[PDB]
Design a protein around this nucleic acid. Structure first.
Lengths: 898, 69, 69
DNA sequence: ACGAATTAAGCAATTCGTAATCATGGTCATAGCT
């Protein structure tokens, strides 16, 4: 295995790096790198930039003098070529060839902390003490758990492993034993020595990647600040291998994100890593929620608040923190993200942290590819941000249209960049711009034959290939090859599993197997003669190859999908208003052209004249097949809903490829581009269940729609799937019971129809009054408790909850209960009219309950209806009127009319 | 206040259990310490020792009060 | 810069102006108002519209300059 | 959301205007009865 680097930093004019040697050990080396730049020259030079002009090289002895030189070219208005960042250049020259790595050697430390405090602990100042630390090391594969007993909040007993092993019935913590065997427990009396030991452990076992759930949001800022304000600045820097740690403040999303940078180790916060590398929009990104959704492992329930949890059940507290760390380890193991980031950083030959910013990775790979072909990259120009039109979202008609077929093209923006060259140097001049209607209707004449054009109106070369589409094509080819290897390994593993089921052989020898290829039938016959142990080992090796294929495949996927985000940023090396506008309007005209063409094609196929059939095609995604094709033929031809789905597939395949083929062929010919790379594919198919009055699919407003999808991307479902977006169901504003009720109502309106919705609404109205008030009342913040109280006078228009606070205060007069303070979360319960309380609402601190003496009275006076019409009746009414339905029975006389 | 609590970047000495202000104003919570000068956000400072900031404050104050007289 | 790159604190004034000031005098400063040259100036420019200091395209018509020494 | 090189007394408070949204009085229009 070749020497691969762990991390790279720059110290002064030198560059230091930690690497894994050829002997499998970690070593640190410092090199006085000598970058070589380039400049525009009049004479010939084999080194050409993307523009093709000659570039004279220039070697430099030091980093600072090179920076001075580029400053000198900057102040004279002369373009200076080469690459600006130098760690990437050092990496490229140091390795050049592709790098082979083993995931075992790189040390990944997965950490979490727990802090107990009355007020919510502040990451920035960290007033409170630290008492629970968990640090999992992969090299040693051990959970170092630092536990502090004697705090300023009261000492507690030790932590017992065998006690935690036992079930909750016996008073334990049900932590699986295999975890405890890998747990090293360190109890500490005072607070300083535990921090010293944590720094010492960090020193002996320096992580290469330091990760954890929301680590950059709490763990790091808290550990750093506590060490700074308890031990001093010198101790805080000991964490950094080169003693260099820095703190920045970012004012995005209410700010308060003191992102800490440690030079020498990579901070790879798992929250955003999962946010951007999973494409899954969970209702809440809490660790418990994601672990439950994916690992299907439930957290042990606990009682009371977190701050008292330490003093109530210390054993439970430490076991919860260890479980948390195990859960983040499990989500990592199943998703396989550390392997992904390793493959990223070693494919693009870049430092680890740069993975977070797509533009850095794209710059790295582009520069490496250009250096492969003796090219030299240009220098980025500093420009202001200018907004350009985004996606022309088709306006939704809020009318239910029963069955719908939704499709969209895969990786549209790279298709734009590839089929029509948008590389920086392929600009051949301006092109006469017409109004958008002329281009969309095809009325405008053909732009040109010599060079291809875009609706922005800039001449793009057809004969000459650019550089950016070259890289996109390379990545696309690699993705296609690795996905083919994925399919080959999948069928190989399936074949070996079938062979094992048929009966394994009696050979314990492991032969060589060619990787990432398709097995032959004779190979399967030979493999059938091996032992079940060796066959299982072969299946395990094939599964590890499949994991490598997963890493590479989704690596290529996300690189492709981040290219466009890279090009749209000013700091990217190839930013241009013209290019981004060209690709965006190209997408817009493409989708609108598809919409109008499918309209006229359905018109000419079904015999309708001037009729409209394109549904609400939000952004690129287009929704078609509203209410015509199925009726034209007849529902009588379907003895089963599955038969209707099969006919759906049949006529979709009949009418999809030639229509879209000729449509996008016309589009590329109109634009006269080098090639066409835009393919449709039926993604989601929704339709009301056969033989039922349910509607299936409706639309409320922009980005608000629910579809009764059946066969999503060629995956037949035994049961309907309610693909819902925009409603209150996924939103967490309403209580979970209300969310379940809303989801059930949606299923009812899309599956069976009116009468069932009516009966469900009636019975839920009947059973709502018996539900707990904790889940069916309001909750709101309370501040400025006085608010010109004036003995119960509202003062400043108490917003229906501070008035309830005043009512609760008046009611509990004489009970001696704790008065309501400023900023407290208070539960509010509207009271029935004419109440002795004197107010049609009451508010008691959230989490607490009204004194049972007065609570019984407030429970007797409740307008369950008010809350019901606020949170539940209004959304149901909006949805039902959005689909031509009525959720309240009218009970007309028509039954006697007939 | 700086001269009284004797607060300065050098004179920090550690932390004590912070009680809410509501029971500090009423004078119900116990004395935070016995050998350190405590500030009611829950901090302690070095007793019988002058920091740089209080010393400069004292000098400027003595000059100002001289001109006052 | 090198000490920052290594990561150890470099103690002392980073600004050398007042460092040289302290090294030069050390003791207290005895000054005199009449020895310090304080100057005031005022400008008037006549033009069709409001003149712009960023452009100064109009001539200067009235100069006045007071000197204290 | 990585631009990357960098910089200079503090906070609590009222009051008014603007933009958004819901409740409603005066008046007009409809109409109905005499």
């Amino acid at each position: 295995m070749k020497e691969f680097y762990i991390s790279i930093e720059t110290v002064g004019n030198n560059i230091v790096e930690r690497y894994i040697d050829e002997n499998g050990k970690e070593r640190t080396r410092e090199v006085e790198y000598l970058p070589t730049m380039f400049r525009h020259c009049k004479e010939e030079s084999k080194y050409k930039d993307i523009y093709g002009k000659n570039c004279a090289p220039q070697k430099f002895p030091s980093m600072k003098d090179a920076r001075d030189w580029m400053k000198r070219m900057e102040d004279i208005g002369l373009e200076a070529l080469g690459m600006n960042d130098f760690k990437l250049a050092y990496i490229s020259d140091t390795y050049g060839s592709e790098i082979v790595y083993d995931r075992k050697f790189v040390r990944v430390a997965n950490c979490d902390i727990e802090v107990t405090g009355d007020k919510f602990p502040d990451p920035m100042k960290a007033e409170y003490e630290i008492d629970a630390i968990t640090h999992y090391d992969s090299i040693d594969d051990r959970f170092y758990v630092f536990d502090l007993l004697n705090s300023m909040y009261g000492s507690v007993s030790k932590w017992d492993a065998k006690l935690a092993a036992k079930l909750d019935c016996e008073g334990g913590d049900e932590v699986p034993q295999e975890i405890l065997d890998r747990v090293i427990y360190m109890p500490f009396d005072n607070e300083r020595d535990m921090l010293m030991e944590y720094i010492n452990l960090w020193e002996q076992k320096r992580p290469a990647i330091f990760t954890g759930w929301n680590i950059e949001g709490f763990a790091v800022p808290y550990i750093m600040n506590r060490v700074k304000m308890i031990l001093g600045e010198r101790s805080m820097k000991r964490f950094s291998p080169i003693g260099r740690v820095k703190s920045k403040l970012i004012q995005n999303m209410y700010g308060s994100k003191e992102i800490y940078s440690i030079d020498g180790v990579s901070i790879l916060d798992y929250l955003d890593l999962y946010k951007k590398f999973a494409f899954t929009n969970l209702p809440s990104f809490s660790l418990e929620s994601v672990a439950q959704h994916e690992t299907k492992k439930g957290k042990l329930p606990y009682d009371g608040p977190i701050n008292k949890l330490r003093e109530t059940n210390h054993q439970r507290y430490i076991s919860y923190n260890i479980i948390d760390v195990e859960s983040v380890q499990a989500i990592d193991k199943i998703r396989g993200f550390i392997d992904l980031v390793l493959s990223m950083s070693y494919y693009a030959k870049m430092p680890f942290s740069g993975v977070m910013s797509p533009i850095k990775t794209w710059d790295a790979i582009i520069f490496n590819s250009l250096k492969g072909e003796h090219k030299v990259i240009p220098q980025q120009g500093s420009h202001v941000k200018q907004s350009f039109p985004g996606a022309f979202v088709f306006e939704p008609k809020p009318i239910a249209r029963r069955y719908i077929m939704s499709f969209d093209l895969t990786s549209l923006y790279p298709s734009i960049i590839r089929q029509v060259n948008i590389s920086p140097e392929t600009i051949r001049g301006q092109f006469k711009v017409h109004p958008i209607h002329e281009y969309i209707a095809g009325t405008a004449p053909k732009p040109s034959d010599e060079y291809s054009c875009s609706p922005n109106g800039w001449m793009y070369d057809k004969h000459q290939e650019g550089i950016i589409p070259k890289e996109i094509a390379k990545v696309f080819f690699q993705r296609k090859d690795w996905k083919k290897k994925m399919f080959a390994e999948e069928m190989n593993a399936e074949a070996i599993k079938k062979i094992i089921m048929k009966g394994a052989g009696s050979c314990s020898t492991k032969p060589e197997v060619e990787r990432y290829v398709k097995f032959s039938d004779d190979f399967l016959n030979e493999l059938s003669n091996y032992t079940e142990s060796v066959l299982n080992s072969l299946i395990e090796e094939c599964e590890k190859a499949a994991t490598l294929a997963n890493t590479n495949q989704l690596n290529r996927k996300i690189l492709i999908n981040s290219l466009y985000g890279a090009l749209g940023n000013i700091h990217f090396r190839y930013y241009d208003l013209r290019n981004a506008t060209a690709i965006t309007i190209f997408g817009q005209v493409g989708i609108q052209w598809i919409a109008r063409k499918i309209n006229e094609y359905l018109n000419k196929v079904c015999g309708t004249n001037d009729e409209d059939f394109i549904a609400a095609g939000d952004t690129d995604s287009v929704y078609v097949c509203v209410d015509k094709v199925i009726e034209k033929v007849g529902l009588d031809r379907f003895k089963e809903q599955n038969d209707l789905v099969e006919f759906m597939n049949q006529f979709g395949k009949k009418k999809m490829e030639p229509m879209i083929d000729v449509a996008y062929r016309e589009l590329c010919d109109y634009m006269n581009n080098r090639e066409h790379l835009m393919h449709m594919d039926r993604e989601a198919i929704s339709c009301p269940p056969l033989g039922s009055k349910g509607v299936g699919g409706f639309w409320k407003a922009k980005k608000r729609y629910a579809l009764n999808v059946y066969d999503m991307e060629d995956k037949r479902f035994a049961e309907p799937h309610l693909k819902i977006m925009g409603m209150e169901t996924q939103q967490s504003s309403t209580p979970k019971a209300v969310q379940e009720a809303l989801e059930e109502s949606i299923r009812r309106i899309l599956q069976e129809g009116e009468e069932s919705v009516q009966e469900y609404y009636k019975n839920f109205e009947k059973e709502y009054r018996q539900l707990d008030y904790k889940v069916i009342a309001e909750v709101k913040t309370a501040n400025d408790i006085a608010k010109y109280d004036d003995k119960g006078w509202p003062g400043f228009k108490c917003p229906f909850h501070i008035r309830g606070v005043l009512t609760y205060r008046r009611a509990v007069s004489g009970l001696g209960v704790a008065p309501i303070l400023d900023g407290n979360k208070v539960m509010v319960l509207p009271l029935r009219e004419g109440n002795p309380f004197g107010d049609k609402c009451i508010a008691w601190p959230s989490g607490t309950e009204l004194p049972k003496e007065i609570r019984s009275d407030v429970l007797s006076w409740i307008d369950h209806s008010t809350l019901f019409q606020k949170s539940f009746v209004k959304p149901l009414a909006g949805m039902c009127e959005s689909a031509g339905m009525d959720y309240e029975e009218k009970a007309s006389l028509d039954f006697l009319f007939g």
